[PDB]
Every structure is written in structure tokens, then in C-alpha cells.
Design a protein around this ligand. Sequence first.
Ligand code: FMN
Ligand code: FMN
Lengths: 200, 200
Amino acid sequence: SKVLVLKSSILAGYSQSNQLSDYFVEQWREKHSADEITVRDLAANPIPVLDGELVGALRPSDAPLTPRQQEALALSDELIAELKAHDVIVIAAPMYNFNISTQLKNYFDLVARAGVTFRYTENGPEGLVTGKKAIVITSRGGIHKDGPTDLVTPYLSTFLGFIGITDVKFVFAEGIAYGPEMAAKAQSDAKAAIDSIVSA
Amino acid sequence: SKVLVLKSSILAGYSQSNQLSDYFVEQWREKHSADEITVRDLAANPIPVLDGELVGALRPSDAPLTPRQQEALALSDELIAELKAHDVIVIAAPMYNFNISTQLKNYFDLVARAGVTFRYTENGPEGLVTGKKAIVITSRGGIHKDGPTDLVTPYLSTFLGFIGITDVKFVFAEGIAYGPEMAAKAQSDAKAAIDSIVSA
Ligand SMILES: Cc1cc2nc3c(=O)[nH]c(=O)nc-3n(C[C@H](O)[C@H](O)[C@H](O)COP(=O)(O)O)c2cc1C
Ligand SMILES: Cc1cc2nc3c(=O)[nH]c(=O)nc-3n(C[C@H](O)[C@H](O)[C@H](O)COP(=O)(O)O)c2cc1C
């Protein structure tokens, strides 16, 4: 198949989720070497903030668009085509201030578009990005998993399910802020979880 | 007292949460006319995205800061001083793509700072923005309240509680996307909720 890797950390080479994404990539190339892999780093190639002007680019219109709107529309179309073009979608979602990173959020805000990645319907909202497996690699400083301060995990499930990606496996790298021994254990635990997704 | 109003809609004068924030303001001036009121529109006066460079401004250091870091630090300090300087904090939090707006998020990402608005401690993390009443005015297109697709409400409670704002009252303006009759009912329901916060 084709694997999409989205990175969203603001910590570059020091990023725990990026080191895990990279590992994922190495393991996929090893086991499934026909497959092509695309990596988009939403920190190194930043998506603009959704503001009052750019939101108009995302609505179906025959009104003229400002230069920024045109650019934001073309960038929207490129992100969505890329997303639809891949089978396995890997999303690094570090938690910052109990949310995902703004770098990832801006990608979602350009990707969620009525009549393109979802559509309204007699029988509720329906997702149009179909037939995908998503793996979410989520790194955190503290320990949040299965608890009430983990809003990141239910939100990703909600947003991805919305646009049609309902097959999502979460990999967790938690306790990073406790120091290098805990960071190393997180990496080792998370790497075993990846190993079994890849070898399934 | 002193009332802080934060607006975060990208829809300007057409914004439901901004029309409610405005109403809040009129009612507070009416009942408590000694009080001063500050309004910061985080869409009209945008906070920058937290990236790899700006995050360094928010860590206590004696390393030289780049021009952007300096600017982001001064802007951080101005936002936090303002927040600490007010008694009642009103936050318009429209839901976009199951999250708050990026405009609000960027404010939070500059406001959440170790040793300034929170501090670590034997007995867990502890909030340093203390003694505040928060009112959150949250507008949505659909109907989410008390259900599993409402991640916005638990996240605001979590983030605000984290920095010490644990007294939070939510006002809801839902079903906006069903049209002007539902939008008008939402406004009327939300306005009664505000009336009883103000008159308490
Ligand atoms: C701006 C910022 C905010 C953070 N907020 C949280 C937080 O809400 N909860 C948490 O458990 N860790 C928090 N952390 C720690 C990160 O989740 C941890 O460093 C994680 O490894 C980040 O993923 P990454 O290294 O891929 O960037 C924060 C780190 C930064 C830089
Ligand atoms: C970019 C965008 C995304 C939206 N996503 C949601 C959504 O996730 N759920 C929802 O119920 N309504 C959604 N809406 C509808 C808004 O929540 C509704 O229009 C609300 O009134 C916005 O608050 P405001 O008018 O103050 O901007 C969205 C609107 C926009 C423009």
C-alpha cells in the first residue's frame, strides 16, 4: 500500500513522536518494501491558521477569492488529495496544553470540508475519507491514558471518525517529563506497539 | 470588580459568541457600573502560533532570545498580567472541528507557563491564576451538550483548572446550523443564562 506520515511536534529532532514516526517508517520499509511512503512535517512545512478570510476559501462558491483564499484553497485541495491517495495514515499527535499541537490542528482545519471529506445526509453527517487504517502516535509528558485529562484521544477519534476514518489504533508514549529513563521506557513500549501493528 | 472578555470567533460581526459576549458586557455595565471592562479580540488582535522558536521564549533562561522570542515573551507577559489583573474572566469559545478556535488556543499556549501561571509541587501541579470567576460562552452548530462529542467543555475545564481557574460556569448556544429560528432560540436561552450569572 501507500503510507502517509504526518508529523506535528514543534521540537524537531528532539521530538519523541517524530523518533517514533521514524521508527514506524523503518519498520514498514523493512516488512513491506514495495510500499511508498510520504512524510509531511506540519512543523517544517507549516499550514496557516484558519482565520476569517481563509474560511471563505473552504466554502463552495462562485464569488472571487482573494489571493490568500486562492492559495489556501489550493493548499486545502493538495492536503486532501494526499490524504485520499494513501491507505495507512500515521498521525503524530504530541499533547501540548491538553490539546494537540496547533500545527496538526491547522491541517485538520483545512482538511475538514463539506462535500469533500464529509457530506450531510438524511442519516446524519457522513465521512468521505473511506477505506483507511489510521495509527495515532501520541506522546505526553505526564500520564493521562484512560483517565479524564486525556481529551486528546477522544477528540482524535471523534474528528477522524467524522471524516470517515473510523479504524484508528492509538500508540502511547507517556511519562516523558519524568526524565530520560521514563522517556526510554515510553519509547520501548511504544515501539513494541508499533511492531505488532506493522507485523499484523 | 474588573471583567475580562476574550473573544475568539473568526466570524467577526456575524459571530454568535461575540453577540453573546457583547450582551454580557451590556448587562454587566448596567448592573455593576463602577466596574471596568476589558475586551481582547484574539481574532482582530491575533496571538502567534506556538512553534519551535517561540516555545523557547516561555522557558526561564539566561540564554539570549531571538527578536521573535523577545516579542513573544513580552506578549506572553502582557497576556498574563492582564489575566491576573481581572476578577471575572469571560471566554467566548466557539467550536470549530470539535476543538476550540486556533485563535483561543494560541492565547492559551502563551498563557500556560511553568512558574508563572502554574508550578510543580510535592502535591501535584498547582495553579497560580487564583481567586477568579470564569464564564465560558460556547456556541456550536450542532447539538453536543452532555454528550460524547463535546470535548470542548471538559478541555476548557481541564485547562482552566490547571492554571488555577476552577470556578467555571458554562453557557451554551447550540443548534446554530439549523437556521435562524434555532440560532434565535440559542441566543435567547444563552442570554437568560447570562442574566442569572450577572444578577447572582
Ligand atoms: C508547549 C508544551 C506543552 C505541553 N503540555 C503538556 C501537557 O498538557 N501534558 C503533558 O502531559 N505534557 C505536556 N508537554 C510535554 C509533551 O507532551 C512531551 O514533551 C511530549 O514528548 C511532546 O511530544 P514531542 O516530543 O513529539 O514533541 C508539553 C510540552 C510543551 C513543549
Ligand atoms: C471552521 C468551522 C468549523 C465548525 N465546526 C463545527 C463543529 O465541529 N461542530 C459544530 O457543532 N459546529 C461547527 N461549526 C459551527 C459553529 O460552531 C457555529 O457556527 C458557531 O455559531 C460558531 O460560533 P461563532 O458564530 O461565535 O463563530 C463550525 C463552523 C466553522 C466556520
